Amino acid sequence: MNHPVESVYSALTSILLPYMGEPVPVQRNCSCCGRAPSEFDGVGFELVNAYRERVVHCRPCQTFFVSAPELMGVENPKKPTTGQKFGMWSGVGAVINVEDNSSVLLAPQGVVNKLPEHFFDHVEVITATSGQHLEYLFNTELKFPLIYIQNFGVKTYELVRSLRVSLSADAIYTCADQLLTRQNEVLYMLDLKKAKELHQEIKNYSKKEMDIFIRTVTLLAYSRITPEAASNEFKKNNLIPLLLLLPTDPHQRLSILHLLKKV
DNA sequence: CCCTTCGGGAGGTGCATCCCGGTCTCGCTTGGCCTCC
Numbered sequence: 349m350n351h352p353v354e355s356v357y358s359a360l361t362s363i364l365l366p367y368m369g370e371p372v373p374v375q376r377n378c379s380c381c382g383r384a385p386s387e388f389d390g391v392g393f394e395l396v397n398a399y400r401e402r403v404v405h406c407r408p409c410q411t412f413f414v415s416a417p418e419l420m421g422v423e424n425p426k427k428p429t430t431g432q433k434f435g436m437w438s439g440v441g442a443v444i445n446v447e448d449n450s451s452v453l454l455a456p457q458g459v460v461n462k463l464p465e466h467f468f469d470h471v472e473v474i475t476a477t478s479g480q481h482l483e484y485l486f487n488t489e490l491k492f493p494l495i496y497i498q499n500f501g502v503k504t505y506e507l508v509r510s511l512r513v514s515l516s517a518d519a520i521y522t523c524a525d526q527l528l529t530r531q532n533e534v535l536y537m538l539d540l541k542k543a544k545e546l547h548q549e550i551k552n553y554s555k556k557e558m559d560i561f562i563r564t565v566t567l568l569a570y571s572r573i574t575p576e577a578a579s580n581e582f583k584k585n586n587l588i589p590l591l592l593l594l595p596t597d598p599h600q601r602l603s604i605l606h607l608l609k610k611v
Numbered sequence: 612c613c614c615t616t617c618g619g620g621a622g623g624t625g626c627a628t629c630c631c632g633g634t635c636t637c638g639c640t641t642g643g644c645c646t647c648c
């Protein structure tokens with residue numbers, strides 16, 4: 349019940365409620381999310397994947413493998429009878445407001461074209477490419493707690509095991525279909541608050557000074573310029589407060605810079 | 612058991628290339644289609 353996949357299912361993937369059929373009583377944990385059957389009420393959906401493996405998917409997890417062409421359009425014309433699947437979308441993200449239980453889908457223009465009219469009635473979709481997810485997140489007033497999926501991808505198991513509720517703008521957890529180990533959440537953690545304050549205070553600096561700051565910090569985070577050189581560049585360009593507002597972590601620096609150069 | 616020399620003088624110049632030709636990949640899942648059992 350109170351797990352990350354359940355919220356995204358209720359808010360976003362409940363649109364294909366008609367297109368699964370009834371569950372089946374199961375006696376083994378859902379291989380996709382991995383949690384225990386005790387929170388499935390003893391029911392589950394059996395399935396066999398493209399690799400011929402018997403896998404049990406619970407109610408909110410099985411929705412990532414449902415074929416609903418009459419709702420989700422056709423994903424590949426070579427196979428008309430299998431429409432877009434939530435677990436197979438690559439480049440498509442979403443933002444799910446758990447407390448409101450609503451969802452907004454960030455799909456590129458191609459996917460939006462492939463989606464039928466009936467899809468938009470249940471889920472509001474805004475055309476945005478993979479790089480434009482950050483633009484929507486920055487510009488639009490997010491409502492927390494929320495689940496921000498960045499790349500539905502094709503590795504549905506890793507996607508569901510990477511879902512994490514973003515309790516506030518200080519730490520928005522991106523779910524990019526890559527298994528969110530404790531080693532790599534720095535690459536999937538976005539601090540919209542720090543990026544927002546840095547963007548607010550960057551207005552005081554020239555465009556040339558901006559380019560200089562971004563390039564210097566990027567090179568430093570990639571160890572392509574010595575720290576003394578970067579310090580000289582910051583001091584000569586009066587970029588000290590900007591560095592003071594940057595995280596010490598170089599990967600977070602790169603992430604927030606990537607966000608900055610998108611907005 | 613002598614007594615070992617002087618110094619002259621020390622380059623001038625050439626000529627220093629052309630051209631190629633810089634790769635595939637793939638890190639996922641699924642169904643359609645092919646033959647196999």
Ligand SMILES: [Zn+2]
Nearest residue numbers: 378381406409
């Ligand atoms: Zn599950």
